[PDB]
Write a protein that binds this ligand. Structure first.
Ligand SMILES: [K+]
Ligand SMILES: [K+]
Ligand SMILES: [K+]
Ligand SMILES: [K+]
Ligand SMILES: [K+]
Ligand SMILES: [Mg+2]
Ligand SMILES: [Mg+2]
Ligand SMILES: [Mg+2]
Ligand SMILES: [Mg+2]
Ligand SMILES: [Mg+2]
Ligand SMILES: [Mg+2]
Ligand SMILES: [Mg+2]
Ligand SMILES: [Mg+2]
Ligand SMILES: [Mg+2]
Ligand SMILES: [Mg+2]
Ligand SMILES: [Mg+2]
Ligand SMILES: [Mg+2]
Ligand SMILES: [Mg+2]
Ligand SMILES: [Mg+2]
Ligand SMILES: [Mg+2]
Ligand SMILES: [Mg+2]
Ligand SMILES: [Mg+2]
Ligand SMILES: [Mg+2]
Ligand SMILES: [Mg+2]
Ligand SMILES: [Mg+2]
Ligand SMILES: [Mg+2]
Ligand SMILES: [Mg+2]
Ligand SMILES: [Mg+2]
Ligand SMILES: [Mg+2]
Ligand SMILES: [Mg+2]
Ligand SMILES: [Mg+2]
Ligand SMILES: [Mg+2]
Ligand SMILES: [Mg+2]
Ligand SMILES: [Mg+2]
Ligand SMILES: [Mg+2]
Ligand SMILES: [Mg+2]
Ligand SMILES: [Mg+2]
Ligand SMILES: [Mg+2]
Ligand SMILES: [Mg+2]
Ligand SMILES: [Mg+2]
Ligand SMILES: [Mg+2]
Ligand SMILES: [Mg+2]
Ligand SMILES: [Mg+2]
Ligand SMILES: [Mg+2]
Ligand SMILES: [Mg+2]
Ligand SMILES: [Mg+2]
Ligand SMILES: [Mg+2]
Ligand SMILES: [Mg+2]
Ligand SMILES: [Mg+2]
Ligand SMILES: [Mg+2]
Ligand SMILES: [Mg+2]
Ligand SMILES: [Mg+2]
Ligand SMILES: [Mg+2]
Ligand SMILES: [Mg+2]
Ligand SMILES: [Mg+2]
Ligand SMILES: [Mg+2]
Ligand SMILES: [Mg+2]
Ligand SMILES: [Mg+2]
Ligand SMILES: [Mg+2]
Ligand SMILES: [Mg+2]
Ligand SMILES: [Mg+2]
Ligand SMILES: [Mg+2]
Ligand SMILES: [Mg+2]
Ligand SMILES: [Mg+2]
Ligand SMILES: [Mg+2]
Ligand SMILES: [Mg+2]
Ligand SMILES: [Mg+2]
Ligand SMILES: [Mg+2]
Ligand SMILES: [Mg+2]
Ligand SMILES: [Mg+2]
Ligand SMILES: [Mg+2]
Lengths: 76, 283, 95, 46
RNA sequence: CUUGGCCGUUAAAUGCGGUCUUGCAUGAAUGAUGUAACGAUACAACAGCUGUCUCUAUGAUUGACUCAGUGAAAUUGGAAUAACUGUGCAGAUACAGUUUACCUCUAGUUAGACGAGAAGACCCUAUGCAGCUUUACUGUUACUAAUUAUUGAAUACGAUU
RNA sequence: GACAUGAGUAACAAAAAAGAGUUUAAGGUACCUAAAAGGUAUCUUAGAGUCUCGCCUAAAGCUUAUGGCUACGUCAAGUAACGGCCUCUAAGUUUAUAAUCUGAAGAUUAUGACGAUGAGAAAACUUUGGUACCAACAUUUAAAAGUGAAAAUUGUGCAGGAAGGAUAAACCGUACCUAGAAUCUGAAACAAGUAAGCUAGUAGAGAAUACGAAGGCGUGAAUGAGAUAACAAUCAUAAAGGAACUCGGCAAACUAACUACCGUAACUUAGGGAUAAGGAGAGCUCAUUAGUCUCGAACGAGUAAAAAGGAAGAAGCAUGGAAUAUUGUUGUACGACUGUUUAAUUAAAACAAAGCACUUUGCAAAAAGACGAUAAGUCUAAGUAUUGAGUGUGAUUUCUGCCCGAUGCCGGCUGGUUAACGAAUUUUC
RNA sequence: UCUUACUAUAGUCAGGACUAUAAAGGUCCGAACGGGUUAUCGUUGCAAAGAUAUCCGAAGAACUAUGGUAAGCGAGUGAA
RNA sequence: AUGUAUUAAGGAGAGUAUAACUUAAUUUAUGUUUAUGAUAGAGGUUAUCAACAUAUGAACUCUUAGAGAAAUUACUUAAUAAACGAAGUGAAUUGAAAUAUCUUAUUAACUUCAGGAAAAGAAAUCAAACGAGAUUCUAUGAUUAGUGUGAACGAAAAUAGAGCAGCCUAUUAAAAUAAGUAAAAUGGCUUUAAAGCUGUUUGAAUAUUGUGGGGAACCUUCCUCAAAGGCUAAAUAUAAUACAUGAGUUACAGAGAAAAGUACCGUGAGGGAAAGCUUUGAAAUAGUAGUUUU
């Protein structure tokens, strides 16, 4: 069983609660099964990986900027 | 069976201290001692044991007819191998047919009144020493059970039977208890011939404070050492009694002869009351 | 002793006999030796039919526009027991 | 002054002393729950 | 009263020890008295030992000081906030008089600002409190005594007269 | 509530400690280059690592708890190499049942149920009461030896030492942190505090003392670099003197540990005092060897064997060489003594104490004492006058005198008094 | 869940010495552990009770852990 | 805040189309009117371009079988907060310028029982020589009569209004008309000494052909009512919801809460925030500039 972090109902506001836990099961197969390897970043264009990577980078910078502010600091 | 729980610390069923100066002693077990002795027949003494629950010693006796083992208060001098018998349920046919008559106080007392034998007080002659005296006809032994204690038979309600043979007419017999009180005891009351064992119990000395703690006794704080809010004797600068007559923490006079027996509860079995020393120095 | 103590106690927070299941269901009984005997009358099985040759899918083409059923003059249109019985006599009368 | 009275504290005692069952099964505990329920508390116990 | 007298200890004894006692105001289980053993108890002495001192000196590290980075607090009516004498709600940076002083900081220091903090401490007041005490006032109990009722009889004796 | 002052001041000092290279990502500058890009160097932010040095070390290490505002891919039929759940019960709990008591609430006894900090078959395959018991202490025992556990054996002392039941694999826990370097409690990233096991080696009687293999660390810039004044803290040494200091030897110094060494007073409750006091010895090399061990072949040799050993010897200022163990003696008061106390200004002469003494308690239904809006009832106690309770004193030696007037308590008259009750009386409308 | 007492179940106490014992002692020296004698520092402290040294007990009236009981008209607990 | 109407068990946990709410978390149908409504197209996720009315599928866990450390176990078509009501028990602060009687106060609070309301109720009632005619709520009567040393406490008749209902054959199923009762002494409560409540010990009568109770010490005549047996709606209390009104509030106001009993503090009972919008930008305070002085 995988437990979930205790959180506030509305993120930064509300009572403290805990979501339902997650359960993972590992079965021992009689016949092996192998997963394919994830496509290369150059072949993920069917998923619009280019646009998705730009948006992801912007979200990472936004959370990094917030972390710097959460430390009581600013970017010179 | 084990003696455990908060009762060992002086607490009652509410959890509050009702008996002061108790707790922290050694782990003990209670010994089931037979103070009635109703089963007839000979009983073979197997050994004399030490009992932490009483001052006197106990004897592990075995019923030769049944094989069941029991505990009884041992008498002074009683050792292993001895044979004790209880004549409370009645005299055996072997003793009756021999004498022929129903009862012969003469030869009866010479064949039953031995050390460690349990007999009805009526069957014990005057001037004999006994240490498990009962009170009621069908009750257990209650008097003189402690170490080195014994009662004396003073008189018996009886008359003679035309041949110098005394026969019981009344329902009671008079006995002198350890405290010196001569009171009235039933005719069929329990009584064991002899003296309670461990006569030298009251000569022991503990030697140190820790030995009293092992025996479940905790420190006793004097009233003078307390404050006025805690004791009638508390208060005062320095050592001070406060011109206060000695009393308990609840106002009960602790000296002067104040009797704590309830006045309405009059003792109807007393023939000669105890002798009050009246605060005089004995030695 | 602060904010974390005020959260609901979970099995991952303490030991010493705090057992709390996840509503999986009793599949047997406990023994006096500390083991578990499974009762297969309580164990559940999943009845999945044979899907070979099944032409239905969870989607319907959007060329077939959605339409609801009509039961004029019938308040309990689709829940009418008479329509179920009358429709039974004509279609299947045997069973 | 204040003292560190929660040092070595266990959560088995919290449930026994302040838990929900400690209150619904007693006469005075029911009052506590009913008082906190009237005030609108989410945390009725522990 | 008093550092009581005397003796020992000190170069010097209001101390300590011994001793005599007319002890303001010792005293026998609110125990009296004397040893062994024990004591982070209190007092006194000796030997040794030492920077405790004569009388301090040098050395070491960390702070203190400077540069860079981060960045508090008590406090604060407002201030252009000197000395003396006098004055005055009676102890003056601020009033009178006279004197003295270019403007502004840094490190030290604590004489004053009746410095700061704590209604901290004392005394007094209140027809204000709290706990405790008792032969304070007024009361409640433990407990004791008599008696209707539950509860019906017999006999004798004694005392009233 | 906002914003000033102190003030850009204090602080970022657990007496562990740092130095010099290397490298990744993203971004900011300068140059090369003007075809963007790329390259070289540097800086900022967030990391990683190498060599050296130091600190901790019966920890500041490893493995795990209590716990957790650290984080959720932490995986078990059982044993080896696991706990919970489940069975059983202790202390206790009980808005369960019955009976009883009770102004209501409730309380009591019994039974039941619940309740671990305890007990639970087998496995490197598995499913009666000393004829005793498994508290303490000691002893013995898995046969090459030693050591540490487990369990058992035997014994000792008094303080006399549980209960109950039995005997084809679900569900829950499993991550990380353990307080000197980012996590628990202390309002917090606090020099405090917190459970269990392991915790190299040398050297020792040792978990003492010193070093420290592995490991970790030498804090999130919550700091770094300089300089080395006064003064403070923590230390080091010291001429001559040695308490002249001071309320007072406060602080500091002297002393110290070890040996199967010598010797040791007054006094004494005969046990002590006493490790009294005061002295001697110690490391390195070596002659020598009864046995044990080793090698060679009774004997010979050997400490590249453990030990023994002497009035032997060498060197140095010095061989208890560094670290670790804080003086000796004497006269008094108080308290016998070991203990206990104002958590966080008084540790004592106060409290307790063994001992001693007095009062009380006869147990026939309630022994007394204590508790019970108040009872049933509980402790006392499965005790019985050598028992229990209360009170004072405070081991032991030597002793404990006079007064019963006052106060308290106890006992006592065919007494006086005597409320209720009541013979005999009396009044208003 | 601090603390005082009690209660149940458990755990811990290097090594050495004396004493009648192999084991019988509120014995001795001394770590762990538990105390808090004295001094200094600190006093908007590292700390609303800490640091350093020194000192005391350390097989017992010992220390410790997990639970349980007893407290607020009457006073629970109290080596006071 | 008040008023009006309606209603008469409340919360939490976790999950989910983040207006949509219960693992079905946006179910499926009927009727009418649809711009003269109500108050001749496009659009099924590029969705819900329709309101009203009547039905309908689904609706988890805990509180809430037992047990337990609520949201677990183990079972199963197991299930009811507060406030308000009645009775029982019953303080103290306070005032009297102290303080005991008194007052505070038939108060707060606690316990038991009960319903949507409960309680009370159709005269053994009041009046006064005339008469009224159950109960409940509000006002007046009334800082009155009266009590108390004082301080203070404090009715009833009657009047007005809200509601109005009488009965035993109770519109739900009850009486053969009430004896240990009325009443007395005594100890208390209430209180004006009566009446009313009550522990202990005692203890009546039978109807206007004047039997019994009351008419404020008490007796008497008269009047009045008929205890010891019962039923009864409304006006009243409380909570929730909706609506109406405002010389009520407009964000340190209003409420504690414009996202709240949340965050946070506390072992716990318990205590308990801040926080609106796109407008305006006062003072204090800080760094500069201009003029001027130093
Ligand atoms: K009751
Ligand atoms: K006298
Ligand atoms: K006398
Ligand atoms: K006398
Ligand atoms: K009357
Ligand atoms: Mg006692
Ligand atoms: Mg005593
Ligand atoms: Mg004492
Ligand atoms: Mg005192
Ligand atoms: Mg008193
Ligand atoms: Mg005195
Ligand atoms: Mg965890
Ligand atoms: Mg944990
Ligand atoms: Mg369990
Ligand atoms: Mg406190
Ligand atoms: Mg604790
Ligand atoms: Mg005396
Ligand atoms: Mg700076
Ligand atoms: Mg002047
Ligand atoms: Mg001027
Ligand atoms: Mg100054
Ligand atoms: Mg200074
Ligand atoms: Mg300054
Ligand atoms: Mg400075
Ligand atoms: Mg500085
Ligand atoms: Mg770059
Ligand atoms: Mg398992
Ligand atoms: Mg059980
Ligand atoms: Mg366990
Ligand atoms: Mg540490
Ligand atoms: Mg912390
Ligand atoms: Mg720390
Ligand atoms: Mg060490
Ligand atoms: Mg570490
Ligand atoms: Mg570094
Ligand atoms: Mg010198
Ligand atoms: Mg010298
Ligand atoms: Mg001098
Ligand atoms: Mg001098
Ligand atoms: Mg010193
Ligand atoms: Mg020589
Ligand atoms: Mg030489
Ligand atoms: Mg002492
Ligand atoms: Mg001591
Ligand atoms: Mg103190
Ligand atoms: Mg202490
Ligand atoms: Mg102290
Ligand atoms: Mg004595
Ligand atoms: Mg009794
Ligand atoms: Mg004394
Ligand atoms: Mg004395
Ligand atoms: Mg009379
Ligand atoms: Mg505790
Ligand atoms: Mg010792
Ligand atoms: Mg200072
Ligand atoms: Mg000692
Ligand atoms: Mg020691
Ligand atoms: Mg339930
Ligand atoms: Mg359930
Ligand atoms: Mg007055
Ligand atoms: Mg008047
Ligand atoms: Mg009638
Ligand atoms: Mg009456
Ligand atoms: Mg009356
Ligand atoms: Mg009447
Ligand atoms: Mg009248
Ligand atoms: Mg009637
Ligand atoms: Mg507001
Ligand atoms: Mg505004
Ligand atoms: Mg405003
Ligand atoms: Mg402005």
């Amino acid at each position: 069983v995988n437990q979930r972090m205790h959180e506030q109902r509305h993120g930064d506001v509300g009572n403290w609660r805990r979501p339902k836990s997650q359960k993972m099961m590992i079965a021992e197969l009689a016949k092996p099964f192998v997963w394919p390897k994830p496509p290369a970043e150059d072949a993920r264009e069917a998923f619009d990986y280019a646009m998705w990577k730009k948006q992801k980078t912007a979200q990472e910078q936004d959370t990094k900027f917030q972390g710097i502010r959460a430390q009581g600091e600013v970017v010179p | 069976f084990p003696k455990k729980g908060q009762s060992k610390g002086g607490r009652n069923h509410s959890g509050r201290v009702t008996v002061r100066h108790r707790g922290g002693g050694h782990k003990r077990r209670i010994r089931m001692v037979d103070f009635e002795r109703w089963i007839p027949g000979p009983h073979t003494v197997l050994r004399i044991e030490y009992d932490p629950g009483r001052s006197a010693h106990i004897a592990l006796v075995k019923e030769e007819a049944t094989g069941r083992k029991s505990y009884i208060v041992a008498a002074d001098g009683m050792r292993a191998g001895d044979v004790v018998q209880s004549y409370r349920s009645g005299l055996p046919q072997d003793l009756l047919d021999s004498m022929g008559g129903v009862v012969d106080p003469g030869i009866l007392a010479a064949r039953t009144c031995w050390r460690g034998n349990c007999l009805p007080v009526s069957m014990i002659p005057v001037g004999t020493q006994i240490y498990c005296v009962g009170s009621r006809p069908d009750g257990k032994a209650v008097f003189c059970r402690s170490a080195g204690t014994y009662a004396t038979i003073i008189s018996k309600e009886e008359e003679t039977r035309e041949d110098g043979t005394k026969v019981m007419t009344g329902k009671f017999v008079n006995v002198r208890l350890q405290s010196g009180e001569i009171r009235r005891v039933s005719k069929d009351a329990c009584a064991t011939v002899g003296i309670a064992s461990n006569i030298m119990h009251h000569y022991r000395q503990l030697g140190k404070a820790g030995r009293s703690r092992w025996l479940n006794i905790r420190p006793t704080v004097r009233g003078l050492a307390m404050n006025a809010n805690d004791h009638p004797h508390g208060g005062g600068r320095g050592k001070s009694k406060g011109n206060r007559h000695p009393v308990s923490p609840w106002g009960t006079p602790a000296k002067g002869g104040y009797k704590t027996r309830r006045k309405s509860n009059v003792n109807k079995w007393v023939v000669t009351p105890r002798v009050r020393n009246m605060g005089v120095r004995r030695n | 002793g602060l904010k974390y103590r005020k959260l609901r106690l979970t099995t991952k927070d303490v030991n010493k006999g705090f057992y709390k299941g996840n509503r999986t269901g009793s599949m047997g009984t406990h023994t006096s030796y500390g083991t578990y005997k499974i009762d297969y009358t309580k164990v559940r099985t999943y009845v999945c039919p044979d899907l070979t040759g099944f032409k239905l899918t969870p989607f319907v083409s959007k060329t077939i526009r959605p339409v609801h059923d009509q039961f004029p003059g019938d308040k309990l249109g689709p829940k009418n027991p008479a329509t179920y019985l009358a429709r039974w006599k004509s279609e299947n009368g045997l069973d | 002054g204040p003292r560190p009275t929660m040092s070595g504290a266990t959560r088995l005692v919290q449930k026994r002393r302040h838990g929900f069952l400690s209150r619904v099964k007693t006469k005075n505990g029911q009052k506590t729950l009913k008082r906190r329920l009237a005030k609108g508390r989410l945390r009725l116990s522990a």
